[PDB]
Design a protein around this ligand. Structure first.
Ligand SMILES: CCOc1c(C)c(O)c2c(O)c3c(CNN4CCN(C)CC4)cc2c1[C@H](O)O/C=C/[C@H](OC)[C@@H](C)[C@@H](O[C@@H](C)O)[C@@H](C)[C@H](O)[C@@H](C)[C@@H](OP(=O)(O)O)[C@H](C)/C=C/C[C@H](C)C(=O)N3
Ligand SMILES: [Cl-]
Length: 733
């Protein structure tokens, strides 16, 4: 190993090369393992393998006590001569001592080296992409300046700064990445920006606009490559991936204008923040290219038969995939996705979904202009029949009803952390009865989980232990038969609402025509609004059957010595994994990079809108006569309540008592069992007719969605008041 080497001489410490590539310096200013012999010293270090932080005490006092054998210093001064020794000592030793306390604070017995350079004077910093919105084209320097390209947007407390903007964008190309170099124009150090949200690799002409799938799907978690792949292979929409999450391209729809006005207005009725964000993008001149100058309603028997038809499709798939392996397995999944798409996007099925959605809109619009009641379809939707997601939440109460009379079982569940607790219940009295209740519940809802759209996430039936805290809370928060009481009560309120509306309408001009037409919509509403949650349920069912088969293939790849861990298939796309099974070869520098990317994706939060310039845009609400200091959101379930806020990001750790108001990032279908005890819901994402929101209505639960940074603005334990009619939130304490 070379004792010493100057910056250009080095070829491919970390800083040792910030210098490395940079020696080139085109158009700008360029400046300018010796502790190997550090080896008394050695005895101490093997004591660290074994608190006693006194150690740093001598390991680090000898550092100052590290005597530099001249064995080479002249070399040291046989190099810096062209450009003292007491100084090298203070820090050379200084740097070594560095190894002593930090490492302890936060490991390998390998080493860091020292870099020597000179001090000069004239300063702020250069950002290649702005930090505020992550726009790759706009840049900002720190006293701070914001320039796009030779134009500055804002001036906040001046011709040479612009000369500068042009220096960063030069060296940016030398690494390709947007970078962070600080100039005081003489730059000492360099490094890339690692906080930016990735732009969807799409090299179709010009500026593009993307819609966040996470917001519509009520799930903001980063998804693994394989899971991302299966969603992309299912959707008919022009969808792409970025930052471990999914986005839909709508740029072409924005080029024409009747296409635009049908896209902007429609998305605005799922959540107003999309529209406000879109209109802002449109108002950005120079970005978006210049514009140039009744559904059918199925029979009553359709829903029953749509469910039956789907169930048997799953049943057939389950039998066919058992005999498949290797390349045959992948060949089968490719042609089964067509069957998935058929059941999921069946014209009759879509008509059944929209039948409930259209009826909700019809009521909410007409009843308001007639009687003055806003969002009456919420209360009319309470305890709607045949909602596979609503049933899931309430039936967990039934599970708790079985366990409650058994003290021996309860003592176990309260303390157990065994994933295989299902097979330890027969020992206890009532465990056999408890096992049955759990197995039956998991036979209906086991294929679901938080993040179910990601095929690679742990399902309930794979880790039943996550359902335990919800079960325990049900035992503590409720008496027996709470499922029947809650549902029956919902039916009463919904019917009393129906009779009230029809009665009041007959007092208006042309009474018994507004009522009869309303009665028709209410029937349609309560007959179809439940089916809304089912196509998702049928899709997830296929996903879990896929997962089990892919795991078998992953385990075969382990047996064949090709894969190390069988869950490493999660970081390969379907297209790639199919080749691994076929050829028998796999690039693990890729797999490790995928894992490395996923770890940074989790630290990212998807914007409502993402552009080609990496700009992250979330819409703004309009405060029309709403209270000031009120946190605005989208009202999706009528009612006003005061309760204790509970900021909970993971359902497994939710210790919900009666009176609590759930504040969280998202509520996908799997969150439903936590709706039974709370008296209000607040989410950061979601829309009018998305997951969670549709369930809150049927549960008679006041909910406000689309509340930005609700898990940060609202503190856990705070008393808050939410209004699910107007869509605002107040802090009281
Ligand atoms: C401009 C927004 O663009 C999107 C986005 C963001 C999407 O996430 C879209 C999307 O996930 C899908 C799909 C599949 N939609 N296809 C489109 C063309 N097909 C012939 C039939 C249906 C599109 C997504 C898009 C969409 O192009 O843009 C508008 C989406 C709207 O969402 C607010 C709207 C169409 C939405 O429903 C509205 C009306 O309430 C769509 C997505 C569905 O009907 C939902 C009801 C959705 O339900 P959910 O996801 O279970 O809550 C449907 C049933 C989902 C089926 C799952 C399937 C795997 C699929 O890929 N669907
Ligand atoms: Cl344990």
């Amino acid at each position: 190993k070379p004792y010493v080497l100057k910056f250009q001489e080095i070829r491919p410490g970390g800083k040792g090369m910030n210098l490395g590539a940079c020696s080139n310096i085109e158009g700008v200013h360029v400046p300018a393992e010796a502790y190997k012999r550090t080896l008394e010293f050695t005895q101490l270090l093997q004591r660290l393998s074994s608190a006693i932080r006194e150690i740093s005490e001598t390991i680090r006092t000898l550092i100052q006590h590290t005597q530099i054998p001249s064995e080479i210093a002249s070399y040291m001064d046989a190099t810096l001569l062209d450009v003292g020794k007491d100084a090298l000592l203070q820090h050379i030793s200084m740097c070594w001592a560095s190894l002593f306390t930090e490492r302890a604070i936060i490991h390998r017995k390998v080493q860091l080296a020292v870099v020597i350079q000179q001090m000069i004077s004239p300063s702020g910093i250069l950002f290649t992409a702005d930090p505020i919105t992550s726009n790759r084209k706009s840049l900002s320097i720190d006293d701070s300046y914001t320039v796009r390209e030779n134009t500055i947007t804002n001036k906040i407390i001046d011709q040479q700064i612009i000369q500068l903007a042009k220096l960063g964008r030069k060296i940016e190309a030398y690494f390709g990445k947007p970078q962070d170099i600080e100039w005081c124009f003489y730059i000492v150090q360099s490094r890339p920006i690692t906080t930016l949200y990735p732009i969807p690799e799409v090299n179709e002409p010009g500026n593009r606009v993307y819609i966040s799938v996470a917001h519509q799907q009520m799930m903001t978690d980063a998804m693994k490559p394989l899971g991302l792949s299966f969603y992309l292979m299912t959707t008919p929409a022009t969808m792409y991936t970025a930052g471990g999450r999914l986005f839909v391209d709508i740029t072409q729809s924005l080029s024409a204008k009747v296409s635009r006005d049908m896209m902007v207005n429609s998305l605005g009725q799922s959540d107003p923040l999309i529209k406000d964000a879109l209109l802002t993008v449109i108002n950005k001149k120079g970005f978006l290219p210049p514009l140039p100058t009744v559904r059918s309603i199925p029979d009553s028997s359709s829903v029953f038969e749509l469910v039956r038809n789907s169930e048997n499709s799953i049943k057939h798939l389950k039998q066919s995939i058992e005999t498949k392996s290797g390349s045959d397995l992948f060949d089968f999944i490719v042609e089964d996705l067509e069957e998935l798409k058929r059941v999921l996007f069946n014209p009759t099925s879509i008509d059944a979904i929209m039948a409930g959605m259209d009826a909700s809109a019809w009521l909410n619009e007409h009843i308001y202009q007639w009687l003055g009641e806003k969002n009456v379809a919420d209360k009319l939707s309470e305890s709607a029949p045949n909602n596979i997601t609503s049933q899931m939440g309430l039936e967990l109460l039934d599970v708790a009803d079985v366990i409650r009379p058994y003290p021996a079982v309860r003592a176990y569940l309260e303390q157990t952390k065994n994933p295989d607790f299902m097979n330890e219940l027969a020992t206890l009295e009532g465990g056999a009865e408890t096992k049955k209740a759990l197995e039956d519940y998991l036979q209906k809802y086991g294929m679901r989980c938080a993040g179910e759209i990601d095929l690679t996430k742990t399902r309930w039936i794979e880790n039943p232990l996550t359902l335990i805290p919800l079960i325990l809370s049900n035992i503590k928060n409720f008496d027996s038969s709470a499922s029947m009481h809650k549902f029956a009560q919902g039916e009463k309120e919904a019917f009393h609402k129906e009779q009230e509306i029809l009665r009041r309408l007959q007092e208006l001009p042309d009474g018994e025509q507004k009522a009869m037409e309303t009665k028709e919509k209410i029937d349609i509403l309560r007959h179809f609004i439940g089916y809304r949650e089912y196509p998702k349920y049928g899709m997830i069912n296929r996903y879990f059957i896929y997962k089990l088969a892919l795991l078998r293939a992953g385990e075969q790849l382990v047996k064949d010595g090709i894969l190390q861990e069988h869950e490493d298939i999660y970081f390969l796309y379907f297209e790639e994994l199919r080749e691994v099974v076929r050829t028998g070869q796999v690039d693990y520098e890729l797999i490790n990079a995928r894992k490395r990317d996923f770890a940074t994706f989790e630290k990212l939060t998807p914007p409502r809108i993402l552009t080609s310039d990496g700009e992250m845009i979330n819409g703004e609400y309009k405060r029309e006569n709403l209270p000031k200091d009120a946190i605005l959101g989208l009202p999706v379930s009528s009612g006003t309540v005061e309760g204790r806020a509970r900021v909970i990001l993971e359902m497994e750790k939710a210790d919900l008592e009666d009176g609590d108001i759930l504040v969280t990032a998202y509520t996908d279908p799997s969150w439903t069992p936590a709706f039974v005890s709370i008296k209000g819901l607040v989410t950061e994402v979601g829309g009018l007719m998305t997951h969670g929101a549709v369930i809150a209505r049927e549960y008679g639960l006041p909910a406000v969605v689309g509340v930005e940074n609700a898990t940060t603005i609202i503190k856990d334990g705070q008393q808050i008041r939410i209004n699910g009619t107007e869509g605002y939130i107040e802090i009281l304490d």
